[PDB]
């Protein structure tokens, strides 16, 4: 998943794991939640400010 | 924590189609005030003692 609905095919995207991860990253119509590497869940644009 | 994110694009309004004319020839008419007006002729004789 890249930014903005984007799909990337090559998957150089990696980092170091870090503790503490918390991402929201753009998907369909809304945010997808990850916490920790971790699927947390999907997420629609209302329930942020 | 703290979240926020930013607004989407809005829908403009749609400029109105608008209104649409009838050519025509008009004449205007008025309530008469002019007395019907006719020529006659009179006839007498005048009189004294
Ligand atoms: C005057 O004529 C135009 C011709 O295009 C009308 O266009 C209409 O636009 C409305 C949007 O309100 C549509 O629902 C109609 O389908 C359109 N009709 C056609 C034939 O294109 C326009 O609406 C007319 N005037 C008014 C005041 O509506």
Same mark, same amino acid.
């Given at each position: !998943?890249? =930014?903005?609905? =984007? !799909? ?6 990696? =980092?170091?794991?870090?503790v503490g991860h918390r991402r929201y990253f753009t ?5 997808v939640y990850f916490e920790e590497y971790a699927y947390?869940?999907? !997420? ?6 | ?5 930013? *607004? ?8 109105? *189609?608008?209104?649409?004319?009838? *050519? ?6 008025? *309530? ?18």
């Amino acid at each position: !998943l890249g =930014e903005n609905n =984007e !799909l990337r095919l090559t998957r150089d995207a990696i =980092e170091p794991c870090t503790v503490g991860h918390r991402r929201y990253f753009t998907f369909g119509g809304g945010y997808v939640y990850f916490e920790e590497y971790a699927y947390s869940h999907q !997420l629609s644009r209302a329930d942020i400010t | 924590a703290t979240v926020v994110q930013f *607004e989407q694009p809005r829908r403009c309004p749609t400029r109105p *189609e608008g209104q649409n004319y009838t *050519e025509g020839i008009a004449v205007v008419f008025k *309530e008469n005030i002019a007395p019907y007006k006719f020529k006659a002729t009179m006839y007498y004789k005048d009189v004294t003692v």
